Design a protein around this ligand. Structure first.
Ligand SMILES: Nc1nc2[nH]cnc2c(=O)[nH]1
Length: 262
């Protein structure tokens, strides 16, 4: 099913970012995404976290995790496959084509990456007191057709910096990649050791990612945390309702992580 009139970012208008409705390009982009994620269904192949609760919270002492700010952005998978073949995919499976957002190859800046699929969200940051869209790279499923998604989270984060972010910065500072003519900025999401979650909540929640490998669908492994208050499908919301009866206070969390901490 197609969604006509799809919006890339409610509010701000982004030139260079237009929804793909033409075929076969639409089915090709979607198909390629599903194959990279090894998803069989038809919906969003991307990974779906689950709200933290007094039960799965124990997973933090059972294996290595990383944490980071839980922004209020729009989820989007970015399929980078060749020059002028940069596409954004949302939860509704809508596809948007992005013009002038180049992704050079680490070894040959005149080359362009392909068979690459990033995962992250779209945010509307305020710079100099003005709306400016940014894409935060959370994960990376496939790099140049390589199953980097199967690697630990550590390696995937390095791949993004080393393979995606670094090359782009090189061509901007050396070649002709004007960050002002680009549709939006591409910055990497930053993760830290969970034994410092506290520091992140002082300056809107947290998200705990395990070192395991990328997995599409529902990941009861990935825990997103949101204050008991301001805490918003039926089955999905069902885990949000019973979560209100026995909520994980910011204290319960920190205290738990401190107990676990080495
Ligand atoms: N793992 C993961 N969690 C998210 N939470 C919001 N966006 C994302 C994402 O792209 N990946």
């Amino acid at each position: 099913s197609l969604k006509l009139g799809a919006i890339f970012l409610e509010g701000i208008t982004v030139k260079g970012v237009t929804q793909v409705t033409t075929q076969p390009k639409l089915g090709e982009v979607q198909q390629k995404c599903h194959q990279f994620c090894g998803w069989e269904g038809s919906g969003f192949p991307g990974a779906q976290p689950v709200s933290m609760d007094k039960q799965n919270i124990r997973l933090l002492e059972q294996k290595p995790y990383k944490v980071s700010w839980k922004a209020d952005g729009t989820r989007y998978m970015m399929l980078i496959d060749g020059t002028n073949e940069v596409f954004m995919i949302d939860r509704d499976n809508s596809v948007f084509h992005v013009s002038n957002l180049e992704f050079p190859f680490r070894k040959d800046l005149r080359m362009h990456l392909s068979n690459t699929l990033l995962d992250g969200e779209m945010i509307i940051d305020k710079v100099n007191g003005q709306a400016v869209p940014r894409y935060l790279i959370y994960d990376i499923i496939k790099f140049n057709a390589q199953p980097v998604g199967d690697c630990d989270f550590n390696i995937r984060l390095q791949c993004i910096e080393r393979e995606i972010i670094s090359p782009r910065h090189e061509k901007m500072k050396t070649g002709l990649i004007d960050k002002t003519q680009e549709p939006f900025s591409v910055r990497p999401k930053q993760f830290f050791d969970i034994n410092i979650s506290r520091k992140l909540l002082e300056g809107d929640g947290l998200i705990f990612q395990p070192i395991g490998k990328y997995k599409p669908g529902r990941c009861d492994d990935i825990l997103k945390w949101k204050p008991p208050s301001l805490n918003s499908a039926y089955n999905t919301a069902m885990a949000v309702c019973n979560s209100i009866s026995n909520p994980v206070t910011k204290e319960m969390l920190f205290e738990f992580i401190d107990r676990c901490a080495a």
